[PDB]
Amino acid sequence: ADIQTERAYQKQPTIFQNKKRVLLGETGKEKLPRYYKNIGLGFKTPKEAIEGTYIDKKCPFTGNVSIRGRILSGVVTKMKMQRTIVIRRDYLHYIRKYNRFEKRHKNMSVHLSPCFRDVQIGDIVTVGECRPLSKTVRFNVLKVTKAAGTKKQ
Amino acid sequence: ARGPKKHLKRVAAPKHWMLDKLTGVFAPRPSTGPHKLRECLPLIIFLRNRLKYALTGDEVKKICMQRFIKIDGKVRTDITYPAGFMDVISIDKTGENFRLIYDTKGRFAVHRITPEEAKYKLCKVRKIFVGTKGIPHLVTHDARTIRYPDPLIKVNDTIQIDLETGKITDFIKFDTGNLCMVTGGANLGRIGVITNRERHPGSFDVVHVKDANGNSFATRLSNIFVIGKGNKPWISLPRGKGIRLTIAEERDKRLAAKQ
Amino acid sequence: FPMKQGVLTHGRVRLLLSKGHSCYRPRRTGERKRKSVRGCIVDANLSVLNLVIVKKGEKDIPGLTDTTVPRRLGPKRASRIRKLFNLSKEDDVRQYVVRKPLNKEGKKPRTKAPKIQR
């Protein structure tokens, strides 16, 4: 339930929390101001990046990462691995000797921010790129767009 | 490899310098300076190929060590000095006063100017920013920075600064309708009025340019250099007037003047 | 192999010497070089040893502690020429410089003075 589950105090490095809890500022109604930003190239900010309560350095909507560069799209093929999913971008490569195409793929590890809930197996996700985040994770999840759902019994 | 390069091979040189193939292995290798080196043209081959005041590389030095070769009103004595675009040279003894302008085939032109229009030059700005203690700065096409500019001067604006004073005389704003010169890509050397500025957020911004003779074209925004207010240039143009001719239309205008 | 202050070991060791220790003048900047240098303790395995008086005692050894050689290059910077001749202040350094005599045979007998510094 709670957020402080690591072994250091997770917080956002920019907002200041402890602003003079006195007889004016009561501990009965206690929020903290939530830092988010906006990405350009027409990408909205999900409600759970504003009214959410999580913490992620690597989230594009509350961390210190900035998308600029290529923008791609893929299919979520494996959703293990906390805050980092694997997506597969299938494509066709053209061999001009045989005048035909060749169904290739290469999959790619991307940082899934926890401002997205209904990210299940086989969904379409547009993905932007940034600085290197890990050994292999260079790209970052901007906007899921669902598949295979909207009614399940 | 382990550091910077300071030779340049002759077949690796920019071909709008119009070099030989058999006179040597090496290239003039322009010095570090205000201009990037693929765009520019050094002092050596300007006074032994473009003007023929010299025959060797030694003859360029013994004119340039007598301290009358004035690049933008300043005596620069190194013979590999990067000149660049829109700068005035000043021989000052036989008084030629060239300005470096592209012709419509992408090449720098031997191009005289009057001894009082020579007193200034024009500069596209590449960045405007606020400096320390809150004062504005701009940095230009060449390396020249100016403090306290007129606050209407945004990015990709063209200002006019005079030599020997160094301050902004008149600025002229990048607007649709103004008269630009393209200094990059396959269309450079042509001169035409701006049609529209169609933005791309995150990508490269491309503008469309109509000439004075209907031939419309387009280059990206980092190639555009405004030198006119609507229809008249602020500088002296060369022959051709920034109008590319087709290879059949170049044919008869070349072979009827040899009548 | 010339001796070095600071070995405290009789024999011959090999030091890695940079610029400025002793017994190694380099050839390019930052070059270090390993050279075999002899220790600071004395033995009987010495071809010559240098030896410096700190006190004259009884009498004159002929040709060793007499015949005072003239320091023909005097002070040049204008703060040791003020300290040598006890110039108090603003006492016109340009007057009180030393001047060296010159006595070639085929040329007229000159005299040379330095520049000044500071």
């Binding site: 402080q4 690591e6 072994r7 250091a8 105090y9 917080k11 200041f16 929390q17 402890n18 602003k19 003079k20 809890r21 006195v22 007889l23 004016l24 050994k135 292999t136 | - | -």
Partner: protein, 204 residues
Amino acid sequence: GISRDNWHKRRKTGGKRKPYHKKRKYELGRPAANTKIGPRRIHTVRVRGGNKKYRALRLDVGNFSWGSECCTRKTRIIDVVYNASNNELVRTKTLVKNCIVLIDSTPYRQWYESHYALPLGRKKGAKLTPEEEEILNKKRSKKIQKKYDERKKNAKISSLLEEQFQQGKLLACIASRPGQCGRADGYVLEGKELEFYLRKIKAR
């Protein structure tokens, strides 16, 4: 000759990649400074660009910040009490960035007394003659007593934080990078953050 490059790692599939050049100089040797509490030893190493970094071999004081009432003072460092990255960096008293450090309370006490004129740390009284009975009264004027008696709004502190003004030492957190810049700055723990770390020391 310890390097920091990726071309000795096994790649994403799991394939051994064969090295295609010697190790270069921009993967320069990376030893640790291990800044620890003592007198002040600072060492300087030239880096690329000809620049310097001041690596801190031994540290004495800090420049810790207060934040909630906006105070920064020099203060000496007592102890390292908890580290999140390693519980073995606290048995050897080694200053790193996000370790909870322990400093004293004297410059913040005399700040809080020179601005609000309240006692602070005091539990029994009856020894406050030499520099404490004088400061809270001082024979002020009229309008100073006006502007100081209205300060009964921003004078109260949450009970976890003045309890450790009483018995001597305040625990804080370094925010600087010692061994890299050569300073140990930081902020004083307070708030829900302080409840977090006071549990994570009490649980040790």
